Design an enzyme around this catalytic site. Structure first.
Site, short mmCIF file in Angstrom:
data_model
loop_
_atom_site.label_atom_id
_atom_site.label_comp_id
_atom_site.label_asym_id
_atom_site.label_seq_id
_atom_site.Cartn_x
_atom_site.Cartn_y
_atom_site.Cartn_z
N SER A 96 0.78 -1.25 0.00
CA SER A 96 0.00 0.00 0.00
C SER A 96 0.81 1.30 0.00
CB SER A 96 -1.04 0.01 1.12
OG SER A 96 -2.12 -0.86 0.82
N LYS A 101 0.20 3.90 -2.78
CA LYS A 101 -0.96 4.80 -2.80
C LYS A 101 -0.58 6.28 -2.69
CE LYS A 101 -4.07 1.10 -1.38
NZ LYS A 101 -4.47 0.20 -0.24
N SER A 129 -6.03 3.51 3.72
CA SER A 129 -5.53 2.43 2.87
C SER A 129 -6.65 1.67 2.13
CB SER A 129 -4.67 1.46 3.71
OG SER A 129 -3.58 0.99 2.95
N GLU A 172 -5.30 -3.63 -6.85
CA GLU A 172 -5.63 -4.24 -5.57
C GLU A 172 -6.63 -5.37 -5.78
OE1 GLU A 172 -4.23 -3.87 -2.84
OE2 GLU A 172 -3.50 -1.80 -2.61
N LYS A 229 2.91 6.33 5.33
CA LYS A 229 2.02 5.39 4.67
C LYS A 229 2.60 4.00 4.82
CE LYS A 229 -1.46 3.85 2.52
NZ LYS A 229 -1.46 2.74 3.55
N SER A 230 1.83 3.09 5.40
CA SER A 230 2.33 1.74 5.67
C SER A 230 1.83 0.79 4.60
CB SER A 230 1.88 1.24 7.05
OG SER A 230 0.47 1.18 7.13
N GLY A 231 2.40 -0.41 4.59
CA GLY A 231 1.94 -1.45 3.68
C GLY A 231 2.16 -2.82 4.29
N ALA A 232 1.32 -3.77 3.90
CA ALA A 232 1.46 -5.16 4.30
C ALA A 232 1.00 -6.04 3.15
CB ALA A 232 0.63 -5.46 5.56
#
Length: 263
Positions: free
Chosen positions: A45, A48, A105, A141, A209-212
């Protein structure tokens, strides 16, 4: 500080997986510390932010309007869409979609935005045109989170991502108004509590901004600094680990505590 690289390698040991790391000076653009800076990691993510960067570039050029409303179909809805699921009837503006994509997100929000610009291939063209010739988005996504080992689809390099974020936030690339909006959305990130924010002292500024993703993929990009002003960029990615979400979160937060400690 070398101590922070010790912690980054320690994270790599605990997770049993590669960790990529960049600490970048926001003003000069010079790398302060790095680990695995030109190895590929899935963006998840974190893309984004780049997406809304492209959207804001179109706004700057008069090709898009933040107030433009998009009505969409329940058929567009994909997993984890906490905002978009709630506006089938009334629709959402471009501004509201970027808010949802970055602060929450929201996955459907991101796909709708990709559609407005012409898809992943156009995001990639945008990146190339702004001097990032390595970061690439290929899928929508949620497939872009697949993180197949050695797959170059939907990846960046920590060094490229750091430079790209800096250009989006402080460059001439976007107008001031757009830079202000982009960083405002990142500051309002609601879903990155357990990462860098958990090591951030009161009074510090953070926009992130995080992502997994699959296969233990986890990451974050951020602009942060003391006294309510950002002064550094941090980029952390990992992939391949079998560790739980909490353990992966903890390692990233611990890397954050170290860079803060040796700030």
């Amino acid at each position: 500080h070398p101590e922070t690289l010790v912690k980054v390698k320690d994270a790599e040991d605990q997770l049993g997986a590669r960790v990529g790391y960049i600490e970048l000076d926001l003003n000069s653009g010079k790398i302060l510390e790095s680990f695995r800076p030109e190895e590929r990691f899935p963006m998840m993510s974190t893309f984004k932010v780049l997406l809304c960067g492209a959207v804001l570039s179109r706004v700057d050029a008069g090709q898009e309007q933040l107030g433009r409303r998009i009505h969409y179909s329940q058929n567009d809805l994909v997993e984890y869409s906490p905002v978009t699921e709630k506006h089938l009837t009334d629709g959402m503006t471009v501004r509201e979609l970027c808010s949802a994509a970055i602060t929450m997100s929201d996955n459907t929000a991101a796909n709708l935005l990709l559609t407005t610009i012409g898809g992943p291939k156009e995001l990639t063209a945008f990146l190339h045109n702004m001097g990032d010739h390595v970061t690439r988005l290929d899928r929508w996504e949620p497939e872009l989170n697949e993180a197949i080992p050695n797959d170059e689809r939907d990846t960046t390099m920590p060094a490229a991502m750091a430079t790209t974020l800096r250009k989006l936030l402080t460059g001439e690339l976007l107008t001031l108004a757009s830079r202000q909006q982009l960083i405002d959305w990142m500051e309002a990130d609601k879903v990155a509590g357990p990462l860098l924010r958990s090591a951030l002292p009161a009074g510090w500024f953070i926009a992130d901004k995080s992502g997994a993703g699959e296969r233990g993929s986890r990451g974050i990009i951020a602009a942060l600094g003391p006294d309510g002003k950002p002064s550094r960029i941090v980029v952390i990615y990992t992939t391949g680990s079998q560790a739980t979400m909490d353990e992966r979160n903890r390692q990233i937060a611990e890397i954050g505590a170290s860079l803060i400690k040796h700030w």
